[PDB]
Design a protein around this ligand. Structure first.
Ligand SMILES: O=C(N[C@@H]1[C@@H](O)[C@@H](O)[C@@H](CO)O[C@H]1O)C(F)F
Length: 576
């Protein structure tokens, strides 16, 4: 009636693989955690000819050798919900297949005949948990099921404390799209950035904060990315050309958005913690749009970057914006940002921003993300992000540039997007994200940027397909059901793997400071990282170059994590 086994969180259990999945029989799991850490696992279940109703998974408490308790309340077991994804990229003919990308709800599930269904297991180790080897069990029952399943779980909690994100130097930046969340939840224009809107922003922003999120995107012009996404990108700063004929700037949305992020502890502008990333002085395809009171219509202009028109406009804005930010106590964390723009384009922004100054001797910090590989010029950009496919693994150019930038107190990250492998798509193996984070440390960068926190298509919970990109590329979280009372978002295996990677690179860095006698050995481990090459599937999506490369991504991420935890054991053995 019902089959069950522990499954890996590294990859998806797909319906198409029913025949193979049916063969699984793993009944134990063990892992290593620090105090304040989290672990993940998964149970995969399958039906045969009969449907099975009221399938439930229940956790025992977790008990260490001393009898100390980690309550079953710290263990959340959530069904993985499938959604439909076109498996291609810009390929409407590609197969539309289901993927268990959504960490959905706890409680009971009815499963139809001849089906795979899996449940994600999230284990939180309290920040005051006692060290030790903790044992517990997860039981699977269902109405029809004669013999229930009990799976035996253990985890060792090492006597070291997982760093708080504030206590690390990890840089994490995921682009938020609060007007997309408004659209999905039918928040009207009149209620934008009111508590009615915040209802649906607060919880996912706390999720972002809690995993290490520091960067906060804000749009400063209309349609900065030329409406590449399903949803428009409105400006948080409204532009009007008035009756006399001058430009006015309405900062209301900007202010309410930023203050929210301050209130939640993502930004701290007095303290220079976090970033405000203002996109952009170079909108994609150059259009600057504004409401002209004469002629009363919306209007636009196409100035190419650098010109006198361009200089004066952005001067104007940057001037107002400066004063505006000085008013707030915010100016020190504000970056003017550019997304994959020309080298010649960047030239201008550095020059114009050079000029706009205040009586205090202060300057607008600058940010650029590049889809392309002498620091004279780049040193004038305070935060740069380089795409993974543009990092040559067989050169030290990246690592040397990032080492240099760090010496100057500048920011450097890596990003992934459409066409990358490893990456963070619905179709990706979730372990690819943990690899991605490790790779940011291998290249000696500050961390990881991704354009895609919450860029929902129409109804992600049922279909994720979009005209462009691999499926799921624009969002790392799902919305909740539209009418939901309570829940406002759901996480994903791929997001949980990015979280894991972040925790673990934070471990490595903590250990290299705490254990000088082990630092070189830790570094040797980190710099042993192998890199899979990329290929494409038949439908245009990036994938591993081969089965061997695909398996390498997974094995490497595990090898490094386990290495670091075994070094932690050695240091603990030392300082006892
Ligand atoms: O991710 C970035 N840029 C673009 C995005 O704006 C979007 O086009 C994305 C689609 O996967 O491709 C990224 O390269 C960022 F690195 F600047």
């Amino acid at each position: 009636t019902l089959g069950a086994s522990i499954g890996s969180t590294d990859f998806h259990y797909l319906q198409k693989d029913y025949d193979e999945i049916k063969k699984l029989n793993l009944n134990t799991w063990n892992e290593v955690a620090w105090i304040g850490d989290e672990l993940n696992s998964k149970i995969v279940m399958w039906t045969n000819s009969s449907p099975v109703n009221n399938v439930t998974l229940s956790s025992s408490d977790f008990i260490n050798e001393n009898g100390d308790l980690i309550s079953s309340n710290n263990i959340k077991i959530s069904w993985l919900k499938e959604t439909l994804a076109n498996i291609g990229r810009s390929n409407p003919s590609a197969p539309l297949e289901p993927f268990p990308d959504i960490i959905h709800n706890s409680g009971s599930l009815n499963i139809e005949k001849n089906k795979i269904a899996s449940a994600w297991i999230n284990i939180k180790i309290p920040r005051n948990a006692k060290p030790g080897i903790y044992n517990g069990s997860i039981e699977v029952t269902a109405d029809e099921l004669e013999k229930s399943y009990t799976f035996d779980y253990s985890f060792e909690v090492l006597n070291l404390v997982q760093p708080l994100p504030s206590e690390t130097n990890t840089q994490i930046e995921f682009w938020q799209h609060p007007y997309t969340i408004a659209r999905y939840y039918k928040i009207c224009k009149e209620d934008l950035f009111t508590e009615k809107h915040f209802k649906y922003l607060r919880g996912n922003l706390k999720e972002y904060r809690n995993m290490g999120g520091r960067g906060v995107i804000a749009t400063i012009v209309h349609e900065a990315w030329n409406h590449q996404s399903y949803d428009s990108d409105p400006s948080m700063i409204k532009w009007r050309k008035n009756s006399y004929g001058t430009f006015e700037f309405d900062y209301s949305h900007f202010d309410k958005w930023i203050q929210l992020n301050i209130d939640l502890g993502i930004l701290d502008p007095e303290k220079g913690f976090g970033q405000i990333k203002c996109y952009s002085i170079v909108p994609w395809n150059n259009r600057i749009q504004y409401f002209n009171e004469a002629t009363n219509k919306e209007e636009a202009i196409n100035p190419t970057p650098g010109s006198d028109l361009w200089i004066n406009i952005w001067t104007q804005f940057l001037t107002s914006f400066m004063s505006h930010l000085e008013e707030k106590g915010w100016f020190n964390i504000t970056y003017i940002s550019m997304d994959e723009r020309s080298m010649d384009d960047l030239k201008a922004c550095v020059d114009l921003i050079e000029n706009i100054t205040n009586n205090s001797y202060e300057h607008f910090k600058i940010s650029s993300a590049m889809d392309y590989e002498d620091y004279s010029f780049l040193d004038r950009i305070d935060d740069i992000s380089i795409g993974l496919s543009h990092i040559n693994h067989n050169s030290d150019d990246m690592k040397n540039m990032a080492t240099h930038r760090q010496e100057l107190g500048l920011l450097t990250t890596i990003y992934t997007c459409t066409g990358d492998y490893p990456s963070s798509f619905t179709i990706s193996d979730p372990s690819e994200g943990a690899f991605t984070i490790w790779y940011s440390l291998y290249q000696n960068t500050n961390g990881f940027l991704r354009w895609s926190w919450d860029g929902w298509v129409e109804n992600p919970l049922e279909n994720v397909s979009y005209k462009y990109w691999e499926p799921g590329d624009p969002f790392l979280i799902y919305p909740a059901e539209k009418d939901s009372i309570g829940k406002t978002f759901y996480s994903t295996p791929r997001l949980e793997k990015l979280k894991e990677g972040i925790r673990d690179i934070n471990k490595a860095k903590y250990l290299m400071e705490k254990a000088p006698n082990l630092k070189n050995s830790i570094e040797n481990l980190i710099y042993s990282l192998k890199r899979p090459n990329k290929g494409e599937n038949a439908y245009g999506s990036a994938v591993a170059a081969s089965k061997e490369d695909r398996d390498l991504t997974i094995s490497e991420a595990n090898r490094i994590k386990n290495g670091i935890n075994n070094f932690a054991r050695e240091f603990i053995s030392l300082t006892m």
